[PDB]
Structures are given as C-alpha cells and as structure tokens.
Amino acid sequence: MYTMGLDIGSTASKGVILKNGEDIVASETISSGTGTTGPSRVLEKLYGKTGLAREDIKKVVVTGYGRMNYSDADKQISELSCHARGVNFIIPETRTIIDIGGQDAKVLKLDNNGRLLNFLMNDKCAAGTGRFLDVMAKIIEVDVSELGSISMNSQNEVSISSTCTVFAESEVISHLSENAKIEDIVAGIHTSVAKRVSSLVKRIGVQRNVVMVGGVARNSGIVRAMAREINTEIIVPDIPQLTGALGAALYAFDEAKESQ
Amino acid sequence: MYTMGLDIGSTASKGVILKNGEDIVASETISSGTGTTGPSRVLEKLYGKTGLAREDIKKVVVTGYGRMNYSDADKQISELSCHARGVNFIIPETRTIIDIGGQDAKVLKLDNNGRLLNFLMNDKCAAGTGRFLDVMAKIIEVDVSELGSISMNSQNEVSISSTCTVFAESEVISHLSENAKIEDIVAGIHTSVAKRVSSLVKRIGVQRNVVMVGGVARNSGIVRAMAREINTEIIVPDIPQLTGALGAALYAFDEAKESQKEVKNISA
Numbered sequence: 001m002y003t004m005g006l007d008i009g010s011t012a013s014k015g016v017i018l019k020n021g022e023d024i025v026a027s028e029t030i031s032s033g034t035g036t037t038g039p040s041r042v043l044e045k046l047y048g049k050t051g052l053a054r055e056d057i058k059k060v061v062v063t064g065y066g067r068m069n070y071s072d073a074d075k076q077i078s079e080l081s082c083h084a085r086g087v088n089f090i091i092p093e094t095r096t097i098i099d100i101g102g103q104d105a106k107v108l109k110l111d112n113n114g115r116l117l118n119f120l121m122n123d124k125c126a127a128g129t130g131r132f133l134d135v136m137a138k139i140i141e142v143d144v145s146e147l148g149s150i151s152m153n154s155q156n157e158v159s160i161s162s163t164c165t166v167f168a169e170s171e172v173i174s175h176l177s178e179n180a181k182i183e184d185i186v187a188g189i190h191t192s193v194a195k196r197v198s199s200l201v202k203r204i205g206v207q208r209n210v211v212m213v214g215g216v217a218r219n220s221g222i223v224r225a226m227a228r229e230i231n232t233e234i235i236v237p238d239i240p241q242l243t244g245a246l247g248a249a250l251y252a253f254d255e256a257k258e259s260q
Numbered sequence: 261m262y263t264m265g266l267d268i269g270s271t272a273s274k275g276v277i278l279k280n281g282e283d284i285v286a287s288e289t290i291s292s293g294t295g296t297t298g299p300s301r302v303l304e305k306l307y308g309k310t311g312l313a314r315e316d317i318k319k320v321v322v323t324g325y326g327r328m329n330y331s332d333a334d335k336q337i338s339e340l341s342c343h344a345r346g347v348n349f350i351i352p353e354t355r356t357i358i359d360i361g362g363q364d365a366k367v368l369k370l371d372n373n374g375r376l377l378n379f380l381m382n383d384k385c386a387a388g389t390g391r392f393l394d395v396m397a398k399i400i401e402v403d404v405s406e407l408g409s410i411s412m413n414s415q416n417e418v419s420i421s422s423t424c425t426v427f428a429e430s431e432v433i434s435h436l437s438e439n440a441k442i443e444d445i446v447a448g449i450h451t452s453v454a455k456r457v458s459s460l461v462k463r464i465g466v467q468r469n470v471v472m473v474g475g476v477a478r479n480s481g482i483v484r485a486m487a488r489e490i491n492t493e494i495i496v497p498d499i500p501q502l503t504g505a506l507g508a509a510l511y512a513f514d515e516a517k518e519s520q521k522e523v524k525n526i527s528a
C-alpha cells in the first residue's frame with residue numbers, strides 16, 4: 001500500500017510517499033512554503049519519482065503551519081505529533097527533539113512512549129532560527145547549503161558579540177570589510193545560533209537520546225556547534241528536514257489500517 | 261566663558277558650545293558616531309561656526325558610548341546624568357525621560373532634584389530603536405526624516421503582528437507588494453516602536469512631566485504614537501537629539517565655576 005505525508009511550513013514544503021508503513025519510495029522538498037505553489041509542486045514531484053497518481057494513495061495527512069489552509073487531506077495533524085512520530089520511527093529511545101526551522105526553534109521532551117511531556121519554543125525572535133542563517137548567507141553571498149562545509153575550514157573562529165540578528169549582520173559586514181576569513185565568519189555564525197538554541201534546550205533539560213530535525217539540521221556545522229554547546233551527543237537522521245512529513249505519512253498508515 | 265559638551269553615541273556625534281552656562285551659541289549633529297570621523301567633524305563645525313578655537317573653551321565634557329576612548333576632555337560623564345541635566349535645563353518638573361537612540365531605548369525616572377530614581381533600557385534587540393526605523397525606511401524607500409509627516413495622513417494603520425525587526429520587515433515588504441497605502445504602512449511601523457518603548461515606560465510608571473529625547477524623538481509620528489500608547493502628553497524639546505551634549509556642556513560649566521572658586525582675585 002501507499003500513504004502520503006505533507007508538511008507545509010512557512011518556509012518549505014515537504015512530502016513523503018510511504019510504502020506499507022515502512023518504506024519511503026519518494027521524498028521531496030520545495031523551498032517555497034505556506035501560501036505559495038509549494039504544496040502543488042511537491043505533489044507533482046512525488047508522483048513523478050514513483051510514477052503514481054492521486055488515486056493510488058489510500059490516505060494523506062497534512063501537518064505544519066499551512067495544513068489548515070489546505071484541502072483536501074484526510075487528517076490534519078500537529079507538527080509536534082508528526083515530528084515525534086517520524087523521529088521515533090527512525091531513532092529509538094528518543095527523549096528530546098530539537099526542531100530548527102525557517103522561522104522558529106522548538107524543543108520537545110518525550111516520554112517512553114514518544115508522547116509529549118514538555119515543550120519550549122522560540123518563535124518571536126529571528127536569532128537562533130533558519131532566518132538568521134538565511135540572512136547571513138545572503139550577506140556572505142553563499143547558499144545556505146554550503147555553510148556547513150565552509151565552516152569546517154575554520155581555524156580561528158570570529159566571535160559575534162550581538163545576539164540580535166540585525167546587529168549581528170552589522171558585525172558580519174564589518175568582518176567582511178576587513179577581510180576576516182569567510183570560514184571563520186561562518187564558524188562564529190554557527191556558534192551564535194547554537195548558543196541561542198542550546199539555552200532553550202537547557203531550560204527543559206537535556207534527556208538522551210537527543211535528536212535534531214528541521215531544515216537547519218542539514219547544516220553539519222550547526223549540528224556540531226549544538227553538540228558542543230549542550231555537551232551531549234546529538235543524533236541526526238539522514239532526512240532531518242523530512243521527519244514531519246514522514247510522521248504524517250505514518251499517521252496516514254495508521255488510518256489506512258483503521259479502514260480495513 | 262565658553263564650555264563644550266560632546267555626546268558620542270554609537271550612531272551619531274553631537275556637540276554644543278555653551279556661553280556662560282546659559283546660551284547655546286553653537287550646536288551640531290553628525291550622523292557618524294563612535295568610532296568614525298564623526299567627533300572630529302562636529303568639532304570643526306562648532307569651532308568653524310563660532311570662530312572659536314580649543315583655547316577659548318574653559319572646560320570640555322564628553323558623554324555617550326565613546327566618551328571613554330575620547331581624549332581629552334576635562335571630564336567624561338554618564339549619558340544618563342547628561343540627558344537628565346540637559347532636559348531639566350530646558351523643561352522644568354521633568355520626572356520621566358525617554359531616550360530613543362540609534363541602537364537602544366532608555367527610560368529614566370527622576371526625583372524632584374533631577375536625580376535618577378529608576379531606569380530601564382533595551383539595548384539587546386533592534387526593535388523599538390532607531391535601527392528598526394532605519395531598516396524600514398530603507399525598505400519603503402523614504403528618508404527617516406520624512407516618516408513623521410507621512411504618518412499624519414494615516415486613517416487605517418496597517419498593523420504589524422511581529423515584534424522582531426526581521427520578521428516585521430517581511431510583513432512590510434508584503435504590504436508594499438499589495439500596494440497598501442504608504443501612510444498606513446508607516447503608521448504601523450511607528451506603532452510597533454511605540455508598543456515596545458511604552459512597555460518600558462509602563463513598567464517604570466509614567467510620571468509627568470514626560471520628555472522624549474534622542475534622534476528618534478525628531479520623528480513626530482513616533483512622538484504621537486508614544487503619547488497615545490502611554491496615554492500621557494509628551495514634551496519634546498526644540499533640540500531633542502542634543503540634550504546629552506547640552507547636559508555635558510552644563511557639567512563643564514559646573515567644573516569651570518568650581519575651579520574659579522579655588523582662587524581669589526585681588527584687584528585695586
């Protein structure tokens with residue numbers, strides 16, 4: 001059988017096609033989010049890779065910030081639930097999940113069943129989110145996808161003193177003007193983000209296993225800096241940005257069984 | 261006698277030459293702060309315009325972020341003290357001072373002698389400061405000096421839901437694309453700043469007279485929105501951006517009189 005999960009965030013749209021409730025036969029990410037052609041183009045592509053059509057999908061569930069402004073799905077489910085489901089499907093004994101997306105950072109604490117025990121989120125400040133990195137990458141004139149590997153070359157990381165995205169940009173521009181090494185600039189950028197998010201994590205208390213998901217988790221530099229700041233191993237799946245859409249597809253699989 | 265006050269902030273450098281502790285004979289703002297060529301060009305303009313030279317100045321005081329790092333003045337004094345002194349010189353019975361500058365906002369509560377009783381400051385976040393306005397003005401393609409007049413024509417403010425400068429910027433850009441009325445976009449911008457600064461005022465407790473100073477107080481749209489948010493009349497001096505330099509020049513006058521009093525002058 002096939003089920004579908006859609007995760008339409010305010011920054012990107014994520015889709016997964018799941019097989020018999022255990023095999024992803026296609027996944028897709030479009031860097032356009034809620035209220036764009038994001039969802040449309042996502043389906044388009046999944047149908048391509050697998051060669052399937054809407055008829056072939058027994059159940060579809062949508063999650064993320066745009067789930068409600070979207071018809072038609074069978075269920076619309078909280079992205080907190082969907083990320084937890086997807087992560088637990090890949091990584092067992094997960095007790096802390098750190099979701100860093102385009103415009104917010106979330107920390108979930110789970111009980112031994114994968115159910116939510118506690119939760120903290122920054123969604124008011126652009127620092128410590130993907131927007132911080134997106135702004136900086138545009139200032140440094142590289143794609144966000146390169147930052148992880150660029151920072152790997154850093155030998156004398158440049159500190160950013162400002163926690164504010166706006167004041168930090170001014171510091172980075174200044175560093176750029178006096179020819180600080182780009183790799184050292186990026187290293188300090190990664191550290192600013194990790195400092196912000198790790199403070200969130202320390203408030204709820206780290207409990208292993210700690211897993212990072214979200215688009216920003218694709219940035220290996222951020223993951224390293226986070227592991228440094230919280231002083232705990234961090235497990236990252238190979239499909240960090242897609243754990244929400246995976247979770248939604250698994251709730252879809254639940255639904256399909258339910259309609260035996 | 262002449263004294264001089266210099267207020268070197270992180271955004272702008274301001275200078276005042278004061279005659280006999282009473283008349284401002286020269287004033288000058290240069291939109292470059294610490295540490296640029298800003299202070300030097302302020303001095304050039306004060307001296308140039310008065311034909312005076314360093315020698316004619318009996319005492320010099322420096323204040324602001326960069327007072328340290330400025331050699332040399334007879335004294336370097338807190339900008340809190342300097343704004344309080346300058347404001348009290350101009351506006352009697354002042355009990356609350358709101359200083360909105362390029363990168364922070366401060367609220368001072370003063371006692372009946374003009375002494376600091378309480379204090380709150382946002383200096384970590386660009387929202388609710390001149391930087392927020394500077395960023396938005398760039399986006400809407402208007403000079404920051406034009407914002408006040410534009411906002412006067414607003415009849416239906418376009419509200420900004422985000423408190424963050426970066427997220428708010430995206431909302432404004434969206435409004436511009438939807439061809440929202442510019443005066444209503446600007447009014448919403450002014451309202452965002454006022455909500456964030458007025459929260460400081462309310463925590464400290466408004467006490468009349470309320471005075472706004474700082475370069476952002478030159479934006480009458482910000483002043484109107486502030487008065488609305490705190491539900492109190494706000495007085496703005498003629499020279500809101502220069503009150504720190506004026507306070508410094510007054511402390512310089514105090515120093516000058518003090519040194520006159522450690523000597524006797526005996527004439528026939």
Ligand SMILES: Nc1ncnc2c1ncn2[C@@H]1O[C@H](COP(=O)(O)OP(=O)(O)O)[C@@H](O)[C@H]1O
Nearest residue numbers: 009010011012101102130145214215216218219
């Ligand atoms: N290849 C990549 N490498 C590093 N970071 C990325 C990559 N692709 C996207 N991102 C980051 O992920 C963010 C969006 O992540 P996502 O979890 O999709 O957000 P949302 O769920 O809120 O839409 C973007 O801000 C971007 O910074």
Ligand SMILES: Nc1ncnc2c1ncn2[C@@H]1O[C@H](COP(=O)(O)OP(=O)(O)O)[C@@H](O)[C@H]1O
Nearest residue numbers: 269270271272361362390405474475476478479
């Ligand atoms: N004529 C004006 N109208 C509106 N805003 C102004 C005007 N002149 C300066 N500003 C704003 O005032 C701010 C600087 O204020 P100021 O009190 O000098 O800062 P600081 O003391 O921290 O250097 C800047 O953000 C600037 O854009």
Ligand code: SF4
Nearest residue numbers: 125164165385424425
């Ligand atoms: S600190 Fe900077 S990034 Fe955080 S909310 Fe304030 S303006 Fe936005």
Ligand SMILES: [Cl-]
Nearest residue numbers: 271272291475
């Ligand atoms: Cl200025």
Ligand SMILES: [Cl-]
Nearest residue numbers: 499500501502
């Ligand atoms: Cl002025």
Ligand SMILES: [Mg+2]
Nearest residue numbers: 009064101244
């Ligand atoms: Mg998300």
Ligand SMILES: [Mg+2]
Nearest residue numbers: 269324361504
């Ligand atoms: Mg100042």
Ligand SMILES: [N+]
Nearest residue numbers: 011012031215
């Ligand atoms: N993305």
